């Protein structure tokens, strides 16, 4: 957002950049293109006998 401001002495040039957060952008991507968030893995118990569970 640019906007000139006229005053008695002269002009003042106002510029404003607002970097909106990715999560609240909606249109387009919801995250930055370089960021790679990896999900946390889930634990499992090995072995515990061969076993079966029938129906």
């Amino acid at each position: 957002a640019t906007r000139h401001v006229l005053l008695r002495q002269g002009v003042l040039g106002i510029k404003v950049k607002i970097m909106k957060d990715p999560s609240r952008n909606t249109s387009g991507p919801k995250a930055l293109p370089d960021a790679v968030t990896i999900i946390e893995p889930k634990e499992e118990e090995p072995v515990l006998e061969p076993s079966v569970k029938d129906y």
Binding site: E44, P46, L48, P50, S51, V52, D54, Y55
Partner: protein, 318 residues
């Protein structure tokens, strides 16, 4: 062990990628349809002259990604591939043409399995699902089996007289092998044995035995008709494929090192198969990804990463 010492006879070279699956027809013996990572699918026919044990008859160019698992119908006129482009293709092997493009999966189709009647196809994909198809192109039953990838799905043949339900087992990356039934249209039994992750679940020609294997380097065999626990082999390295033969109670198993061969009940770890390569350094050596026994129980076919179908043969010592 006794007598037979397997010998590399022929080498088939019509691919430019990993030969990810092979399958000889149930009725017809001469055919060998080989599926690969380079999108093609090649029908070989056994000649049995000099080094050329087989030579290529027809290539089936019709996929936009890998051709993972191929199945042949009972008779040996149609074949169903399972590609990485989220589809299957029902071919006309003799004609050199497609027929049924199967749409529905939201993930690369890893395994396919056709019924013994050549009627009801069933396939599994990296989609947490197993879908059931007809011989046309239509999704009938949809199985919400596992929570992780479903790596293999293979139908077990039956003889003892007609229940109605046909049975298969679904390998997964959830560390759970799971048996099914399709006319209850649902579960048989869960075989929660594996420690690491499963690649292969192969039912035998008998049907009552089912060898499961994967990254663990331990091959867990399962009893299917009795629905009970059975043997567990150690194979050191990661298993890419398994293969039962009609000749005996042989269990062939393609490890990361080579191809190990066991007797099932009398547990002895007998023969290893390893061919030669030009140059190379340490722990790479092109390994067998898939392999297939013929209907004779004579010619062993081995799909390798190095674009060759290597052909081993039975030869008695005495």
């Amino acid at each position: 062990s006794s007598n037979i010492m397997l010998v590399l006879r022929g080498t088939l070279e019509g691919h430019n990628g990993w030969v990810t699956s092979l399958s000889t027809s149930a009725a017809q013996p001469n055919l060998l349809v080989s599926g690969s990572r380079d999108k093609t699918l090649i029908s070989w026919r056994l000649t049995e002259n000099e080094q050329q044990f087989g030579v290529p008859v027809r290539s089936y160019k019709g996929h936009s990604h890998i051709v993972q698992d191929v199945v042949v119908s009972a008779d040996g006129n149609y074949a169903v591939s399972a590609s990485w482009d989220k589809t299957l293709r029902l071919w006309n092997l003799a004609t050199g043409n497609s027929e049924a493009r199967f749409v529905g999966h939201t993930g690369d189709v890893l395994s396919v399995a056709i019924d013994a009647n050549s009627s009801k196809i069933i396939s599994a994909s990296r989609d947490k699902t197993i879908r059931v198809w007809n011989t046309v192109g239509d999704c009938a039953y949809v199985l919400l089996g596992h929570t992780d990838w479903v790596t293999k799905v293979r139908v077990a043949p039956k003889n003892l007289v007609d229940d109605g339900r046909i049975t298969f087992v679904s390998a997964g990356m959830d560390k759970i092998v799971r048996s099914w039934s399709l006319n209850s249209y649902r579960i048989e039994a869960d075989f929660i044995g594996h420690n690491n992750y499963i690649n292969v679940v192969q039912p035998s020609p008998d049907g009552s035995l089912a060898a499961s294997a994967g990254k663990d380097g331990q091959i867990y065999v399962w009893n299917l008709k009795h629905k009970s626990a059975f043997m567990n082999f150690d194979a050191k390295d990661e298993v890419f494929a398994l293969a039962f033969s009609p000749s005996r109670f042989w269990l062939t198993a393609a490890t990361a090192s080579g191809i190990k061969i066991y007797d099932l009940e009398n547990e002895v770890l007998i023969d290893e198969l390893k061919p030669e390569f030009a140059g190379y350094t340490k722990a790479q050596d092109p390994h067998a990804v898939s392999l297939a026994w013929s209907a004779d129980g004579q010619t062993l076919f081995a799909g390798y990463t190095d674009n060759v179908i290597r052909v081993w043969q039975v030869m008695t010592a005495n």
